[PDB]
Design a protein around this ligand. Structure first.
Ligand code: NAP
Ligand code: NAP
Lengths: 485, 485, 482, 484
């Protein structure tokens, strides 16, 4: 299957001539031949975006909204194609790629809905005869760099909202999910957006991504990926004084208190910690349980983990877990497991690997020095930690460099609110999963989980700037030269 | 006179023992002996602010207001001391420092007024039985790094607004204006803020400023200075994934169309372009004139420059201009004049310098390769360009790396608005000077002039983060394990 | 044509019918209900019962129904146009614009439903959480006029539904088939029973029941100011709130530094579109002495180009008839009054059937009826003034205060004049009846209270609810013996 | 001691020449001669206000803020004066009036704080080359009409906030608390406001108030009072199409679930339901408790009600309750106890009354047909209703014509929110008193409890209107005449 870049309105081959084969994580089957673009495909894309910017930003918002609704109609027609690819290229189960596609629809609609309603401000002026307002203005051409785990929805949240509010987009997907990127481009072009407004360039982050980050005609970069990558991207962005949105790692706590429906808490816990093989930035990566319910909770959780069906996600719709994205991740997960075992940890079930599939590894009796407590474990290896009181629940919760999401299960209004207040995270949920997400809410972290927020108006904040503009209606006397009446 | 750091409730001498001497830009006379602090002194300041943070952030906003209102009382009583020191250390005329002092009063008050009123949002949930809201949380320890040209007001806008909304502060004033910084510390202390909440550290930027910028326990740095400096700071800040506010340089365009009162235009142009010796970020640094009034305008502009009185800013109230801040700035103005003469620009007046003083130098017949058209000219050298039409005015206006402020002079509504939305600046003013500033408007630039906004709630946006928080009120079925209903 | 109650088209309990005839030629169009208080009471009761389920589904689900409704409207475009002309007397271009705008209104309501936000506050109390929600008011009365019965009905209806209220709708008696077509659309869109209700009856009966009923929480009204005062007074009884979009007598002010031809072309469209039957019509034209002669000359030149004919005949017809013969008689009274007081009729004034030519007057004074009253028809005065101050004085010399506009290229004159004119809406270098789907539409003085369009429609039909949570116990000041 | 009107910067006697004597609710001793004004007086004030409007509305907000900040200065100096009038004129205890006075300080500061920050909007335009903004404009002269139970704080929340955003004011206090209003005017005048910006007129509501409500040059009326009076005012206001704010009665429910600390619940309940003798719109007027703790709660509640100390509020700072505002109120309360006894209610305590003092009468075993369940009991009579579950609790809670505030005590987050969402009120409070109030939050009710919101920006919403303004920058073509 032949996949190209999308630049300035047309599908074209990389300037470098170089291609690469994308393989399925399921069985290593060849899916598509895809570009390995170089710095100049990037430059061509960026310049294409820059030229298209003036018209795009200056048409009325309602017109951009129409194009997005057009985008939404095409997408609805392309739903199966997207699912099919998210499953086979990305390793997602039916149910996983169903939710991603449903949410993506809601993401695109949301960007459209909001385009006409992003308001500036009329201000009171401290001077007489002065009108003092604030406009919203497009930043310009915006780079969009994304990960492989939820590559469709994460990309569209960035891309659609960026487009809505008058920016042009240069977009480079994760190299592990380039076909999904190509389907996006397909969708954009069947919607008929003007040449240059949206651009796809497939290639390596350190090369294509970096050129995007360091280019002078790029006003802003929005990025989702690892926290180390984020730090380098911020560093490089400083060169041209462009702004950034960094949606980085997470190691989110799921705290269970003792006044819960223990069974329910275990069902929820299993879902939050292990959906998409724990391949989720807002995954319940670290589980924190109250002593009084720990034993029953651990029995039930393991009971339910054991029931998880692992299989070729192409077989049927009821498969619970697919494989990890690549062989490298399986290796990292067996490291995480080994370190725990070696450190005197107790393995309750799983931890085997066959192919790119990894059987969920659940640990108890850990301390703060385990790799699975100090690093983001982006896969199906989870520590359970037992604590004696709420104050201890919060210390374990916050004992991380990360600060993305988090959650607490309880029926006590005070305990819920106190624990919410004390956990150091960008997002928090009382009595739900850690990876709750709506289209228009402010998604983002603190500490090492990143900087800024995305979703609806918050996405608009990121890709626009405030502009103070005034009009003075009465002439005034000026203080210099003091020799004037 | 002897000046000290203010750290953790207490005035103290540098860990390093080292003391520098601060002399007057007016005559070289010794003003005061000031610290030359080290990286050690910065860390002590930072940790103090960290330990004071929790208690300071968690009281109700109305307490924080009461302390700010308290600062306002104290500041009102010191006014003349701030005035004295701005003139004798910064070189500002009476009128200049009077204005800085009045605005600083409004700044302290604006931040106090708004503390209780910085709101979050209650959201419509896409999910049944879900409460979905967004809180405002303070960032934490905020580093405040300021320049020498308007050291009182630029500092206070940052310190007051940052404090109000629940952050703590480590402040490093410009090395050329350390006494102003110390006088601020006096104020804060006289107002009895809790120890550690506010901290002063007088020292070299590349060692004291850098420690602030790279420290772990600092969440945000708000910077005002050169753009080169900004790029540095933004890059080191990336190390700890902290956020920044960069208020960098400007080369703001003053466009004068042909339907104006030409004499008024001149009077405004002079004040805008040359006030405080043109050492103002939002100075009218590049004056752009319609050909139909160019001869008259230039005649008039030069006429009023001639009238500018340059003297000791301590002599009397009616002194138009004082010295530049040091020898280095004079040298720099000399290069600027050299280059422009070297390139065939017609020098109409000024150029004379003695000690730190400098008579304003006006040029015509320039082109876009002149250093005074490509760089920020942070002093009293000013180019005037004649253009033939509105397009041309705009093309020239946007021909710069900077995008801070800007202004157009006309009585025609279409011409004013079409020029306004065509010039690329963070701010813009119609029929007023380029450096309008009210205490609660979004102040800031685009392109190379920086990132973010400061003033009122915009200051608040910079030093807070949004936190999405939810409560789910009905239990749900989860997709895995699919076997289970 | 029938009512729509609790998900059913049904006959009026009174069994009475009345014939709708066409303003264009007097020919019968449809037999429509002539409902009474009982029919209003049933409708009200349906909406009240449907209320709790409809208010409490997520916004995204109400948005879905509206998008569904939007798709149905698109299918019915040519049906809505044909009625707006045959029933309402609108030209092709007039009804097309009404329909396009209605499309955008329906969409706007859907787009905004999910985005109507409350606030989170700083508490002056420690350990206290303090927030504000948005809640539906409940059952909402929607009472409308005949001049733009589609777009006016839908701005109210669509926006009111989106944000969780139920609706009892009552259209003007001169345009009920349009009201009925609306009921059609909602039914084909599949909204839950009771959520939307149509009752076609007389104002002082059906409308008054709606206004005075206990279970109605809010009434949104568009019509004459006298009715607005009736309605507001009767509404007081049950402490329900109202939105009153009332009459206009909008000034169009023309300064001396304008392109006079352009100014004239604009003037004709603003003052005369839909036979002047626009609340935001340029109803009083105000010109600066320095250009008054050429302006009047050009204005007249373009008015005599206007084509008044059967709006059914083709698409380039400029003007149709007035809605009925009372309106023609009243227009005669305005013209007759103006002539009697010594005013100069520049052009026009012929009538026939319900048709009525533009009548243009100059040399008038403030005592002319066409300067004191709303002239909801094609009779228009031009007033010459010597300077800006006088234009403003003349512009403000009215009980009304809906919209208004000034034509000029001088930024100061434009803005100072804007500050000074007393209206809810104002437009610089554009027509007086400027209208977008999401802007705060409404007036001051005698033109009403409140605002419709977008979030403002939501403001009208929601209330703010302050809710708190205290997380620490405290001591209390009584009994002091503790 | 003699009191005057305040019109156009001048303290003047009424046009009628007629005066009246304000006695104390506490012992009946004479307090002041106060005016009985007439329509001519209201008319003069309305005109003064009108004349004063243009200057006041046009100056920049910061200037209005400075005048307010100086009002704050004055009020701070007059604190003890306001306190002692709030007691001798209105019968508040030391603690009640202290709180009203602290809160009033806050309200005035809050008004000043916000004056410069009330923003309009910049809209996206569906047309090309169009600028589209929304301005905030002040309505004009504003009538302010207020009750007697919290005459300082309620008056001042309206007055200051209305003033802050550029309106002018014609203020008429309750005839039972006219001296408080006079002091307000004393304070305005000492702050040096432009003449006619603030006006005080003391007289009967049906004459002075009705004039304010019906006058063509009055733009808006913000009213606090009985719901019935609200209905009258709203009707009369329709004549000139002026807008109103109606802060009417309440009958708030306090719901106590069975998972609480019962003793604390009782302690809270006594404060919420009986503070200022129950003379609070947001008083906990109908108490609703779960069966599993009802016995224990009722005993405890009665225990602390019995401990209450009723006395001359002037004696000292520890008096829990003073008297009702007048003999009429005692009479009404007696009816309420009378009706409850005849309908089969069980009187657990209280009922003794001498002069204007009244001991809190507490009832159980009541039903929905009792007057004290169907009406606002603006005094110290309170029913306690036992329910079997959270459904019944909501059912009883919403069985009113009212819907001002309301509250629930419970440690269960699910029950707490479900209940709050279900109760029909303009304001709700989880685990605090029904009458929580801050300076800047939207205060107001639904149903019979009124229309609109007061407090900070919400006060500003009520006394301003939005103004859509556009600038079009490209000429365009028009559809008539089509021949072109
Ligand atoms: N906060 C959130 O919302 C969120 C959501 C999902 C996932 N995540 C995070 O995403 C991470 C896993 O994704 P990942 O393996 O794809 O992370 P990654 O290795 O950092 O890659 C992210 C993207 O950055 C590109 N990239 C790499 N180096 C670059 C450079 N020097 N300059 C510019 N771009 C560069 C990559 O392109 P290449 O393919 O060429 O490497 C990729 O498209 C996890 O840490 C997870 O927490 C965060
Ligand atoms: N956007 C605005 O609002 C605004 C307003 C006024 C001025 N400005 C700009 O400010 C500039 C003039 O002031 P300036 O010459 O003082 O600017 P600067 O040379 O860049 O230095 C300003 C501050 O940054 C500190 N600094 C220098 N190097 C640093 C480092 N590596 N790390 C941390 N801090 C460091 C300086 O310390 P030392 O003093 O010890 O070197 C000083 O406190 C001009 O560019 C002017 O346009 C901007």
């Amino acid at each position: 299957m032949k996949v190209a870049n999308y630049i300035n309105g047309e599908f074209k081959e990389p300037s470098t001539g170089a291609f690469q084969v994308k393989t399925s994580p399921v069985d290593g089957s060849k899916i598509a031949e895809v570009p390995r673009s170089g710095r100049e495909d990037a430059r061509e894309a960026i310049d294409s975006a820059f030229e298209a910017l003036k018209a795009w930003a200056n048409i009325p918002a309602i017109r951009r909204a129409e194009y997005l609704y057009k985008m939404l109609e095409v997408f609805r027609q392309m739903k199966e194609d997207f699912m099919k690819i998210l499953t086979v290229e990305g390793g997602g189960t039916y149910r996983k790629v169903w939710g991603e596609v449903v949410f993506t629809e809601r993401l695109i609609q949301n960007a459209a809905e909001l385009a006409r309603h992003y308001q500036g401000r009329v201000l009171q002026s401290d001077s007489e005869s002065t009108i003092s307002v604030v406009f919203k203005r497009s930043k310009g051409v915006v780079g969009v760099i994304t990960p492989w785990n939820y590559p469709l929805s994460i990309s569209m949240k960035k891309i659609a909202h960026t487009l809505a509010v008058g920016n042009t987009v240069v977009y480079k997907p994760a190299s592990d999910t380039p076909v999904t990127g190509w389907l996006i481009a397909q969708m954009v072009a069947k919607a008929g957006l003007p040449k240059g407004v949206f651009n796809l360039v497939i290639g390596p982050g350190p090369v294509v991504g970096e050129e995007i980050v360091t280019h002078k005609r790029v006003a802003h970069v929005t990025f989702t990926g690892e926290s180390s990558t984020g730090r380098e991207i911020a560093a490089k962005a400083a060169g041209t004084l462009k702004t950034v949105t960094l949606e980085l790692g997470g190691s989110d706590p799921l705290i269970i208190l003792d006044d819960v429906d223990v069974d329910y808490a275990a069902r929820l816990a299993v879902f939050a910690s292990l959906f998409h093989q724990g391949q989720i930035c807002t995954s319940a990566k670290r589980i924190i349980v109250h002593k009084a319910v720990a034993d029953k909770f651990i029995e039930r959780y393991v009971h339910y983990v054991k029931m998880l069906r692992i299989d070729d996600p192409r077989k049927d719709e009821k498969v619970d877990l697919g494989p990890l994205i690549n062989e490298r991740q399986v290796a990292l997960m067996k490291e995480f497991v080994d370190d725990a075992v070696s450190r005197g940890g107790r393995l309750l079930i799983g931890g085997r690997s066959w192919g790119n599939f990894f059987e969920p590894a659940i640990f108890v009796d850990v301390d703060r020095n385990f790799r699975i407590m100090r690093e983001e474990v982006f896969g199906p290896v989870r520590p359970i930690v037992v604590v004696e009181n709420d104050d201890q629940a919060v210390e374990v919760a916050n004992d991380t460099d990360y600060g993305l999401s988090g959650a607490v299960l309880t029926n006590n209004v005070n305990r819920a609110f106190r624990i919410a207040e004390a956990v150091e995270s960008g997002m928090f949920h009382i009595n739900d999963v850690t990876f709750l997400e709506e289209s228009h809410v402010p998604f983002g972290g603190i500490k090492a989980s990143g900087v800024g927020r995305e979703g609806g108006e918050w996405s608009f904040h990121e890709t626009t700037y405030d502009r103070w503009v005034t009009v003075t209606l009465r002439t005034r006397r000026f203080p210099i030269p003091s020799a004037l009446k």
